[PDB]
Design an enzyme around this catalytic site. Structure first.
Site, PDB file in Angstrom:
ATOM      1  N   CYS A  65      13.856  55.070 105.406  1.00  0.00           N
ATOM      2  CA  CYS A  65      13.412  54.799 104.053  1.00  0.00           C
ATOM      3  C   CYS A  65      12.104  55.559 103.792  1.00  0.00           C
ATOM      4  O   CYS A  65      11.162  55.479 104.586  1.00  0.00           O
ATOM      5  CB  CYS A  65      13.234  53.289 103.816  1.00  0.00           C
ATOM      6  SG  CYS A  65      12.713  52.881 102.107  1.00  0.00           S
ATOM      7  N   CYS A  75     -14.412  33.619  72.073  1.00  0.00           N
ATOM      8  CA  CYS A  75     -15.260  34.808  72.078  1.00  0.00           C
ATOM      9  C   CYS A  75     -16.393  34.672  71.067  1.00  0.00           C
ATOM     10  O   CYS A  75     -16.151  34.323  69.916  1.00  0.00           O
ATOM     11  CB  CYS A  75     -14.436  36.073  71.777  1.00  0.00           C
ATOM     12  SG  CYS A  75     -15.401  37.655  71.878  1.00  0.00           S
TER      13      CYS A  75
END
Length: 706
Positions: free
Chosen positions: A268, A631
């Site tokens: 692989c 915020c």
């Protein structure tokens, strides 16, 4: 190994929408045309290499018919390899093998850092020259290969003495025992199966274990040789040296395939180069729970894999941590990467457990303030409000402090710490604005262009909704595609979506959705919770551009996507002119919109909506800052009035626009522009809407005096 034509496999791989492999990406018509009659020197084909991808769409990579596949089918494999191994300009290369000076090499024991490491493991793989892989081996050459390797192993030095166990002729008793001790491989992986890995099972295959059972070798499992050194604890130095000494001894008996492009060839492509996987199983539950856990690992050169199924029901948080790199570095560089990275991650887990001892359950754990402050150094001290006001006095004062419900200063700078272009913090609850006032107040003054005032933030001033100072800004036809006004709102008594618990989210969603479901008249609509959405609804919401996703890294790193998607939802009235986002960044974003330029009807619909929602809950509101939001940028009115504006005309004047903008305090983004008021704090809602309305109506009469 007989497989379908390359051309058939390509069609299968491409028509399979579950398939997102690199094979799919690079197996183009041109590659197929080029290689469809080509054989390797061992007889292998590209079809044999990509077969497993046709039948296993979850697999990312091809395999290879034999070691020569990488050279023979190079246009395919270099692209796949460069991609998977993140090779800068496709300049694939690999240095000479070097485990380092073993006599003087020393790594600290990894259990030094919190005693979290269950075991340590290093694995290598080698291809022996002169032999194919599964698709090109014969029954007999695989056995010859097996014989060659077991003979090499039998001749190994003293510490490596042990027993060779061929798979052929093994009692089902030892089979069961050996897999129990996790020494035995089995023919149970279908990706390997369809890549030809189990042909002539079980012949040509076996395992070697030394007496001490800390040295394991697999023959012809996937690669010709897989060598594993392993033990309990975090003794990487001994694990690594035992592996290195063995492979250097084996390399005198066996000719391993190597080249200066790919290093050691493997079956692989993922194991090319060093082939080296150095890993620990470590207990890092808190670190693993962080929103950007994967990114934190990769940044430290580490690949995490969970160990689900390997423990009991109530044992969690155990991960396999390994060097992410295989190719383009030495074995020494690789094991060093693993050690340094894992050390750091383990140190972070100890810091996390220490810093969040006794914090409320389900509430986002957070890294120490001083840790995040160092990450925050990447941000600009000129542009980034988060960093600008994080002085040593502030750190000294607020480190170790929590709000009553568990919010910290560390929490609120975290988003900027990991996203250095983010310019504002994200708070954890309304009480943050009083508890961390020395940090937040000057930040707010700066950002909003205001100062500390003796006087209360004025009450909500929406105006007279039947006699507004604005109407339709574009009766004519089209300069305005659409008009929109929104506010953010927090609900009293709940933590913000950043750090709030899953149980909080559920309970909040119950309060809000209940109110939304009861909205009548112009506001009557449907609530779509993200957890129980009916399929048809999901697609329509996207086509409407209404859906929100867990895809902003700034909000993610603030905690905004924790326990996804529990408690999140979308509401809109039947006309899709009134919309509410539930628990995205704020508890609610409340939005009114429509085609055309009738701001008055948009604003009226919005205000009525806010009020109707407000019947069922209290909005977080402050004397200092007006409406409170997650915020600090959206305090005050928390209101954004905007238009989708066609001004191709004066867009071609790019600086009387900006002067129309600065002059009327508007923001512009793109001859189609999204225009909106800039101010949020220091003015009334009515004024905010009216500032945008005048700034835009003036753009518009300028827009024919061309």
């Amino acid at each position: 190994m007989q497989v379908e034509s390359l051309q058939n496999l390509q069609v299968k791989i491409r028509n399979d929408e579950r398939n997102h492999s690199l094979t799919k990406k690079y197996l183009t018509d041109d590659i197929v045309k080029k290689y469809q009659a080509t054989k390797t020197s061992l007889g292998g084909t590209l079809a044999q290499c990509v077969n497993t991808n046709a039948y296993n769409p979850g697999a990312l990579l091809p395999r290879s018919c034999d070691l020569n596949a990488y050279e023979t089918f190079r246009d395919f494999f270099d692209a796949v390899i460069a991609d998977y191994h993140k090779v800068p300009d496709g300049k694939i290369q690999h240095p000479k093998s070097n485990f380092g000076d073993l006599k003087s090499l020393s790594f600290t024991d990894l259990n030094t850092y919190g005693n979290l490491v269950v075991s340590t493991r290093v694995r290598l793989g080698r291809t022996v020259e002169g032999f194919g892989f599964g698709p090109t081996l014969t029954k007999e050459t695989r056995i010859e290969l097996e014989n060659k390797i077991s003979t090499a192993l039998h001749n190994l030095s003293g510490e490596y003495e042990g027993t060779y166990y061929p798979l052929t002729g093994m009692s089902e008793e030892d089979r069961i025992k050996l897999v129990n001790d996790h020494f035995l491989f089995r023919n149970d992986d279908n990706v390997l199966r369809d890549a030809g890995g189990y042909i002539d099972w079980p012949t040509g295959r076996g395992i070697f274990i030394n007496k001490q059972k800390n040295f394991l070798v697999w023959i012809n499992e996937e690669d010709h040789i897989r060598v594993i050194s392993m033990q309990k604890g975090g003794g990487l130095t001994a694990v690594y040296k035992r592996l290195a000494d063995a492979i250097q001894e084996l390399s005198k008996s066996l000719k391993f395939a190597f080249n200066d492009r790919l290093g050691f060839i493997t079956f692989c492509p993922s194991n090319l180069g060093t082939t080296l996987r150095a890993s620990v199983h470590a207990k890092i539950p808190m670190l693993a729970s962080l929103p950007n856990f994967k990114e934190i690992c990769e940044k430290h050169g580490i690949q995490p894999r969970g160990t689900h199924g390997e423990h009991t029901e109530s044992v969690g948080g155990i991960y396999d941590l390994s060097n992410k790199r295989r190719l383009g570095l030495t074995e020494l560089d690789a094991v060093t990467e693993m050690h340094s990275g894992v050390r750091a991650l383990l140190e972070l887990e100890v810091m996390l457990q220490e810093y969040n001892k006794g914090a409320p359950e389900g509430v986002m754990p957070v890294e120490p303030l001083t840790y995040l402050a160092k990450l925050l150094e990447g941000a600009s001290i000129e542009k980034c409000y988060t960093r600008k006001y994080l002085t040593p006095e502030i750190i000294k004062k607020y480190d170790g402090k929590r709000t009553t419900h568990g919010a910290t200063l560390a929490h609120m700078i975290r988003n900027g710490a990991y996203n250095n272009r983010s310019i504002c913090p994200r708070t954890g609850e309304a009480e943050c604005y009083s508890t961390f006032i020395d940090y937040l107040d000057p930040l707010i003054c700066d950002y909003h262009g205001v100062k500390d005032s003796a006087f209360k933030h004025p009450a909500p001033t929406f105006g007279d909704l039947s006699k507004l100072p604005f109407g339709d800004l574009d009766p004519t036809g089209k300069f305005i595609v659409s008009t929109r006004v929104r506010v953010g709102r927090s609900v009293e008594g709940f933590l913000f979506p950043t750090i709030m618990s899953k149980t909080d989210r559920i309970k909040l969603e119950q309060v809000i959705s209940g109110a939304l479901k009861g909205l009548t008249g112009e506001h009557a609509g449907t609530y779509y919770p993200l957890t129980d959405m009916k399929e048809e609804d999901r697609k329509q919401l996207v086509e409407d551009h209404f859906l929100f996703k867990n895809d902003d890294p700034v909000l993610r790193d603030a905690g905004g996507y924790r326990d996804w998607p529990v408690g999140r939802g979308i509401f809109h009235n039947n006309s899709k002119t009134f919309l509410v986002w539930v628990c995205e960044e704020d508890h609610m974003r409340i939005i009114s919109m429509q085609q055309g330029g009738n701001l008055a009807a948009v604003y009226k619909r919005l205000i009525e909506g806010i009020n109707a929602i407000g019947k069922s809950m209290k909005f977080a509101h402050s004397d200092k800052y007006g409406y409170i939001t997650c915020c600090p940028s959206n305090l005050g009115t928390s209101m954004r009035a905007s238009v989708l504006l066609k001004i191709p005309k004066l867009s071609s004047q790019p600086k009387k626009l900006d002067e129309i903008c600065a002059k009327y305090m508007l923001q512009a983004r793109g001859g189609t522009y999204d225009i909106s008021n800039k101010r949020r704090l220091g003015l009334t809602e009515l004024q905010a809407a009216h500032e945008m309305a005048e700034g835009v109506a003036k753009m518009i009469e300028i827009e024919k005096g061309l």
